[PDB]
Every structure is written in structure tokens, then in C-alpha cells.
Design a protein around this nucleic acid. Sequence first.
RNA 1: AAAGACCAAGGGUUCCUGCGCAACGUUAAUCGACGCAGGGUUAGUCGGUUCCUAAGGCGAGGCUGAAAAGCGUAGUCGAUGGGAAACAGGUUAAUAUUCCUGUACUUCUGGUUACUGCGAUGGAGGGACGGAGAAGGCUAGGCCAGCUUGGCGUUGGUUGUCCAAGUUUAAGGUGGUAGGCUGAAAUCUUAGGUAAAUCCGGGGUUUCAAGGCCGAGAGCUGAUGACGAGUCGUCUUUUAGAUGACGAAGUGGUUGAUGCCAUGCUUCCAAGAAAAGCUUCUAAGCUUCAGGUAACCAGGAACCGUACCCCAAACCGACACAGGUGGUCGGGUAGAGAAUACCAAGGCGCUUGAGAGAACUCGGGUGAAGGAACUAGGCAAAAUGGCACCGUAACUUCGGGAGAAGGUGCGCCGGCUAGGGUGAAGGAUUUACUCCGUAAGCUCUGGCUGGUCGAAGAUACCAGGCCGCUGCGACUGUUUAUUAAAAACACAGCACUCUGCAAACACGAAAGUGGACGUAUAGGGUGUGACGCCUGCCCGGUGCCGGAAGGUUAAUUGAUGGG
Lengths: 92, 272, 44
Amino acid sequence: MNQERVFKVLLGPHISEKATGLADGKSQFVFKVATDATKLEIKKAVESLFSVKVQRVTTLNVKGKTKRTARGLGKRNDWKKAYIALQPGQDL
Amino acid sequence: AIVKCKPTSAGRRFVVKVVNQELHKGAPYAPLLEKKSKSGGRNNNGRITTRHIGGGHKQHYRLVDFRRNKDGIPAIVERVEYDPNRTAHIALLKYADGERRYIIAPKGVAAGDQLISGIGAPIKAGNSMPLRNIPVGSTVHGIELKPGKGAQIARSAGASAQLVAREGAYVTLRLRSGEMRKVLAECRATLGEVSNSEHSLRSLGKAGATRWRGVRPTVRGVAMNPVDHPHGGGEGRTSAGRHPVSPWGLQTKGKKTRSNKRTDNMIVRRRK
Amino acid sequence: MKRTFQPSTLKRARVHGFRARMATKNGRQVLSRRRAKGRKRLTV
RNA sequence: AAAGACCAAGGGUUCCUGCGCAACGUUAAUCGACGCAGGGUUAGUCGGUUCCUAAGGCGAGGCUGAAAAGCGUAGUCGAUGGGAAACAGGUUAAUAUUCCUGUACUUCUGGUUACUGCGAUGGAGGGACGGAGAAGGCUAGGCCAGCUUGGCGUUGGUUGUCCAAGUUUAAGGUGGUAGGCUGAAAUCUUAGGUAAAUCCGGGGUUUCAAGGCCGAGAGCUGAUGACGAGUCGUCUUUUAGAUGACGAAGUGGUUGAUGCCAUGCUUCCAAGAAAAGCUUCUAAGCUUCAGGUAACCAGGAACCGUACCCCAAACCGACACAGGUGGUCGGGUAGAGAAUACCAAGGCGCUUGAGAGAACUCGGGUGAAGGAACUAGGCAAAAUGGCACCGUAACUUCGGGAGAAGGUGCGCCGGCUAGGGUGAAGGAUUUACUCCGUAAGCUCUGGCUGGUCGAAGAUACCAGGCCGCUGCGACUGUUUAUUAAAAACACAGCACUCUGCAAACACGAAAGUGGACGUAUAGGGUGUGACGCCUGCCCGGUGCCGGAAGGUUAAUUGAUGGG
Ligand SMILES: [Mg+2]
Ligand SMILES: [Mg+2]
Ligand SMILES: [Mg+2]
Ligand SMILES: [Mg+2]
Ligand SMILES: [Mg+2]
Ligand SMILES: [Mg+2]
Ligand SMILES: [Mg+2]
Ligand SMILES: [Mg+2]
Ligand SMILES: [Mg+2]
Ligand SMILES: [Mg+2]
Ligand SMILES: [Mg+2]
Ligand SMILES: [Mg+2]
Ligand SMILES: [Mg+2]
Ligand SMILES: [Mg+2]
Ligand SMILES: [Mg+2]
Ligand SMILES: [Mg+2]
Ligand SMILES: [Mg+2]
Ligand SMILES: [Mg+2]
Ligand SMILES: [Mg+2]
Ligand SMILES: [Mg+2]
Ligand SMILES: [Mg+2]
Ligand SMILES: [Mg+2]
Ligand SMILES: [Mg+2]
Ligand SMILES: [Mg+2]
Ligand SMILES: [Mg+2]
Ligand SMILES: [Mg+2]
Ligand SMILES: [Mg+2]
Ligand SMILES: [Mg+2]
Ligand SMILES: [Mg+2]
Ligand SMILES: [Mg+2]
Ligand SMILES: [Mg+2]
Ligand SMILES: [Mg+2]
Ligand SMILES: [Mg+2]
Ligand SMILES: [Mg+2]
Ligand SMILES: [Mg+2]
Ligand SMILES: [Mg+2]
Ligand SMILES: [Mg+2]
Ligand SMILES: [Mg+2]
Ligand SMILES: [Mg+2]
Ligand SMILES: [Mg+2]
């Protein structure tokens, strides 16, 4: 990242029960990221934005669900999730 | 060195093995080895083209020096080894400059013998020289046909040729086939007989030993149906029912098949 | 009882996939035929 | 030795939670691999990717081919193989060698310092490997004892030689052991390693013999840690899910792998990948440079997979189908055992039930007297069955036949008695992961006697029926997937014949390829079919081989005649 790509990397926080439990207990925050966002681009984006210090980023790709309904077998988009751990003081 | 096995089981009865205890017990010479992947006797096209080939033992090819062209430099035999590629034994020559090579072992050659090739090579039964320097009457093996091409004629175990006549530029050899052939006197040959002459005395005892050597079974033509073989067909056990032929229809009792007009001048008298 | 279909996606790809078809001229004809008929799936 | 737990393939959300039951589920369904919605898969070390190649593919030019194309060189792909490194504990409804805690390891990048000849597409080494067998050394695991905690038994006894549970702990570091391999060093020189080499190979001297490489495992550390029945918080909350601190013992002996040393060792013949990474040597180049080496500091290790099923209801079989599906782990008692029986850890009772207790069918148990009279035929059944010991015929190719046949003993409890192994002591080498040895204790194998119970002691499961004559095929093997397993096919052995290498022969309009990186003791085709004794007569027919005096005979040529 060396451009306006910083604004196209993080798609938004993930609002699961596992996400909030991770935010409270540990200092990890689950974000939705672009499917072609590397772990380095996510770390830089969360540091430029949100003005925090990132300790480690782990990512995983999530398969979109199919839901064969209503004259055919549809399919939701594949999406990427990032677990972002900061320093203990920071809360993002 | 011919050993008959005791009949401790069926399949061991009639096993007669050639056990040469003078052979090397260790590994072959690695710099002279090379990968040799098997075919099932199969073609460029993946077609068989040669029946009864398949499923033997993995074998390294040994780079045998057929053109003994290191003239002048003496060699020490220093080892005789088993070769899975041929019925003859091979000897690992160590030349005076330290270069190591593989040659077909002559009959009496053992480790420590001195071999030399060239014009002035002494006449002893391990040496190589052009056929013009070999006296008439000598027994030779590993004879070239084209100068520089390498040994081609007497190479299998026990093989030898007889130098019978010498004209101007050609030498007449008597092959173990009984054919009298003309060879250029410039071509090289090695004096003496090839080793492992008792290889013909061996008896495999069982169907498995033939399979160990990569030979698949032969099915007789009379055992087939007419669609597969000219000899096929017949109610009950029947003979060929016709003059015997190959599966492709060529007569196989007599019926000479040589059709090489180019090389006919090299054959003095013909025998097979 | 072993049945005739023993799936292997690697073997399936190498025998019937898009690049296997495009490699030959009769394979390109299959893709032309299946495009002309309008098949949603072109290869497997 | 799975109907348990996994890895792979295959599938693809079936995983978990809330709501739900129309259809799906061979019944009902509140339940579900079903419907709706939400959630869930976290890696420098696992597996890929990336590096390297096998078979094989494609293949610039090229060669060949009416065209389409075929083949193939340089190359470039292609794992099922080779090539860096991670373990334990905790934790979710659902992920974890990935998150957290703790302790490691590997490999890169940047900078600073100090020293310095660096550099491949090449040379050398290395990587790097078969079958079988053996006897060791370990380890996991098992068992016993001791210890800790708890218990004192609805019915005789049970404060004891009693009962129950627990008694755990990895990678890494250190160590260089059991054990395996190999003589080492200096100097001089050199037809070799396509060129060069200081490296390798060869040759000649001198010295010393002990230097080097590999290597399970032990011990120590990792670990004052973690784990640990439970105790105290008891918010609760009934079924005791969680809730957060503490938490005892945590030691010896023996047995012991199919796992590791071991890619070792011995032996055999059928003679046992490749390439790279890696080490080293130089060439072109580069010469204050670059580059290399070592130390320190700083930082990094991207991308993809990860849920779930996986002898299965989620894969292949149209099905929630008695079938098929590669690899790994595999505890206890008995047992030779991965057989078998009963159990463990775990997982299940197989998605219609309820009765009744006819014929008949299926699958079994027992059976008077007889005992193959059945039947095409002892089909089926019944029977035999283990170990040790005694004993064992014709015939034989001397190996066999043979477990021939047949017989005896076998449980349990005592008395006496012979040896394995391990093993504190002690001694030695009181050099050290050393050797000898060791009482007790554990553990294994026996011998001789006596008693005793039952109808019966190889008591269950498990576990040969045997003999005689004869046909065929020598034998192990193979075969009609789905009515034929055979005397058929193969086979070792035998013989005939072809083939002189650009081999015969085969596939290919061809190039080329197989034969074969083989060379007549070889290769092809044909027949016969171990072995033993043998294999007789016929060359008229047909084929094949050899010969060429004569006859006949193609295209071709075109004398002559007739138009
Ligand atoms: Mg991480
Ligand atoms: Mg990942
Ligand atoms: Mg044969
Ligand atoms: Mg045959
Ligand atoms: Mg037939
Ligand atoms: Mg025919
Ligand atoms: Mg007849
Ligand atoms: Mg299972
Ligand atoms: Mg679904
Ligand atoms: Mg479920
Ligand atoms: Mg229903
Ligand atoms: Mg559902
Ligand atoms: Mg090609
Ligand atoms: Mg081209
Ligand atoms: Mg490659
Ligand atoms: Mg692989
Ligand atoms: Mg799970
Ligand atoms: Mg090299
Ligand atoms: Mg082996
Ligand atoms: Mg009482
Ligand atoms: Mg040692
Ligand atoms: Mg999983
Ligand atoms: Mg079916
Ligand atoms: Mg069912
Ligand atoms: Mg099934
Ligand atoms: Mg199977
Ligand atoms: Mg069993
Ligand atoms: Mg009766
Ligand atoms: Mg009776
Ligand atoms: Mg009777
Ligand atoms: Mg009768
Ligand atoms: Mg009757
Ligand atoms: Mg019967
Ligand atoms: Mg029975
Ligand atoms: Mg009965
Ligand atoms: Mg008869
Ligand atoms: Mg038979
Ligand atoms: Mg059949
Ligand atoms: Mg049958
Ligand atoms: Mg026959």
C-alpha cells in the first residue's frame, strides 16, 4: 500500500459473538477485508486508520454459502476475515 | 562354478546357477552408471512391437567402453563385476592416468591384470588393436565394423571370432554363427574369448526366474482363435493346420528373411 | 463392488478440462460445438 | 485390529446455535445429514505454493508428412519420490501443532564493525536408495510395588497382607553413549575429470598409528513451571454446565514392541531411481570495488487449504442401499498371535412397532434303534482338530511321502529341587554415559514326587478327518468380470527355423521408434512341455531351401506385312 488503497482494504468490523468476546478478553478485533488484501496491507491500513499499533494479523477466507432456493442454486460471495491483535492498551 | 540346487522344494529342483565368487561383492562404479528405465517392449507410439517383454528387475545401465581408444596408456583390471545388461562380465579398468572405464571382461582376465590397446600392444588375450596387427589364426572378440564406431560383433558371454584370412584392406573373420565376413583391417578387436562361457550351462528352474529377467509368457498360436493367429481355431487340440507362420503370416520354418543388398559384398560365405 | 466411476479431479481435469480440449484441433471443435449449442458448462 | 480415533482421496457447509415440521426420513416425530436465519475454519515450522527431478507430456528451431498433422533437439512441465524449521499446556456452541501462556527452532533482509579473491549454465564430492535374514541396544506401551487422597460397605466377614482413584509432563538444549563406517598427516609430481582448478583421480616418498564421520537412547535441564483427585469460594440451579483461587502424592522394580538405532550389519542374485538443495574447485568476468567470511544490532517470513463426513447415512454404488474405498494408531485377561472369547478408552442398540406362538419357509439345538439302506454322487451334515512325547508304510527325483497311520499325558493344590535375565552392594579402570559382580526383590524356563474334584481338565471360543486303487496335468501359477478354475493357458526344459547389426521382426504414408544403448552363450517366430527310457518308416502331394542346361514368360523395342 502506497496510495488510496488504504481505504479499500478494510470493509468493516465483524459483528459476531466470537468477535465481541475476542475484543473484550484478548485485544483482537475481527474485520472484514478485501479478498486480495495481504496481511501486510491489513496491518498498514489498521495503523494509518484508527491510529493504533498492530501486533499480529491473521487472515482466513470464508466460503460463501449456496442456499439452493427459488429456481436454481444460488451462491453468496466469498469473503475474507482478518483477526487483528493490537497492543493491550489500544481498543481500536 | 556351476551349482545344482537340491530339491528342497518344487521350483528349486532343476535350478542350475552360475555363481562366480571372483566377482565384485560391492557396489558398481557410480560415475559409470546411468538410469535405464524399462519399456514393456513398447514403441514411440506406445504399441508393443516386440512381444514378451516386461516386469524385470530395476537395472542401472553400465557405460561400457566399446571403443578402446585410449591407445598407449596401460590399464589394470583391478575388478570384475556383474552386469545385468549383458550375459558377459565387465572389468573396471584403471588406466595409468587414473581414468576408470568398463570393458567386456575377456576369458582369463582377473583383477590385477595389465591390458593395453594400440598398434604396439603385446599379443595377449586381453589387448585391443586394429585387425591388421592381429596375426591370422587368432581368436578375437568385440570387433568393430566401422572405424570409430566401437565393438559390435563378438560381445555376449563366451563369444569369439576367428581371423581366417587377410587380404589388402579387408580381413576375413569366421563368426560363431559360422558366417564368413569381411571386416576392414583398420577396425579394432580384442584378443581372446569373452568371459562367462559357462553362462550357457545355467538352467532356470521355474517360471518365476524368466519373469525376473523381464520376459513375459509366450502363448502358442495353436492355442488361439483364428481371429488372433493364423494357427488359431480347431475343435479339440489341433495342429497349425497350415504351413507354420508367424502371427503376421510369415513362414517360420526355413524362409530366409535377409534382404540387405547393400552389405552383401561383406559376406564371404553365409551361415546362421 | 467397485464401480466404473472412481473420481479424481486431477485426472478429470487432465483428460476433459479446458486446456486438454484447447490443446488439440478436435478438442477445439468440441468447444465450438458446445458454444454453438449454448451449453452453460463448457468443460469438466 | 472396530461398529473406536485419525491422514489421504472424494464430497462441499452436511459443522454449531436459534426458530421450525409442509415435503424429505420406508411409521410417528417435539427429533434430524430436512426448511429459514445467524455464526463458525486464524500457521515462518502442518499441507500446499516455491526448489528438484521419474514415467510421461508439450516442445523454439529442426526432420517428416496431400492438408489436418507426426516425431523430436534446446528447453519447459509433470509426484506417487528428493529438498529449512514446533512442541507441551489452556481455551470455543462450533478452530486450533494455527488463537493464548510457556519454552524452542529455521531461514531471509537491512545496517555497523573487522578480515578477505569472489564468481557458473561447468569439474568433483554428496544426496543416493534391492530382497531376505539375524542378534542386539533402546523407547513407547503394559504390569506390579510403594506413596497420596477417599472409603469402612442394604447380606456372613472386611482398620487390613482390605477396597477405589490418581501416581503426568513434550519439542528443544547439553550430552557423543550402545553401536556402525573409514587408516590419518606432510611433501613432491602427474597422458585423467571436454578449458581451468589449489578440488577430485593417479603415482612416489616420510611419519604416526589414532584421527575423523555417523549415531538410537540414558542422565541432567526444559520444569520453583504446567497438570493433578479434590478443597474452599457458592452466584447458582433443579441433572450439577460453568463460575475463581488453592491443590496432596507424583516414586522404584519388571516386562517390553511389528516403533527407533537401521539409508546399519550379514547374505543372496533377479544386481537394486533421478535431479536439485548442500560442500568444494576453478573459467569467462571482476580487482581501492563487487562479492565472501565472522560478530553485533534491527526487522521479516508473503499467498492458498484448514469447518464437517471419511469401512461412511456426507465418497463410488439411482436409495439414509448387508457391496467397494489407500494409509496410520491399536490398551487389559487368556492366547503363539493383528486368530478367538470377554472387556477398556470410546462408540453404539442398526428410523415401523405391538401381539400370537397354525401349516409351511429360513437359520439353528437335541434325538430311540439302525448307520449311506439316501442320492447321479456321502450333496449336506456329522466327525477330526492343541501342545509335548512315543511311533509311523509302499514308493521316491533321496528333498520327500509325513501332521502318514496310530497312541499316551494334560485341571487344581502342595513337598522337594535345577537353572535365565535384571539387580544396592562391593571390587576394579576407585580414568567415567567405564568393567566385573551383587543380597533381597521382580521376572522366565524347567525336573521329580504326592494329594485332590468332576461324567468329562487341548472342558468355552478357537482348532487337520483319515486310508487304499486308478485317469489327467509334472510342480507354484493363469483363465471365460456376471452359469465353465479344468485335463484348458502358462511354465522350467527341449527342438526347428530365421537374424552379421542400419539384424530379423513390429508400429508407423514418412521421419522415427521398439528389438537394444542388446550383438549368435544374442534377438525373433514356431511347436512341444519337469524328469526317466525313447522318439521308428515315407520327400509321392503341399511348403521351404539349393541349382540353372532347357522350355515358357511382363513392361519395353519396333523388323516385316497389310491398309
Ligand atoms: Mg500469528
Ligand atoms: Mg492461513
Ligand atoms: Mg518359450
Ligand atoms: Mg506357450
Ligand atoms: Mg480356445
Ligand atoms: Mg486369418
Ligand atoms: Mg481331433
Ligand atoms: Mg469408524
Ligand atoms: Mg444445505
Ligand atoms: Mg448437525
Ligand atoms: Mg413422516
Ligand atoms: Mg439445518
Ligand atoms: Mg512432442
Ligand atoms: Mg514448429
Ligand atoms: Mg520442474
Ligand atoms: Mg508428494
Ligand atoms: Mg472439531
Ligand atoms: Mg557437478
Ligand atoms: Mg532391504
Ligand atoms: Mg455385614
Ligand atoms: Mg562407541
Ligand atoms: Mg478439523
Ligand atoms: Mg444399484
Ligand atoms: Mg437404515
Ligand atoms: Mg451402505
Ligand atoms: Mg481392498
Ligand atoms: Mg478379533
Ligand atoms: Mg439317531
Ligand atoms: Mg444312539
Ligand atoms: Mg458303524
Ligand atoms: Mg446306494
Ligand atoms: Mg436307492
Ligand atoms: Mg461335504
Ligand atoms: Mg460342521
Ligand atoms: Mg446336530
Ligand atoms: Mg478309466
Ligand atoms: Mg496343473
Ligand atoms: Mg463365469
Ligand atoms: Mg466359477
Ligand atoms: Mg501341448
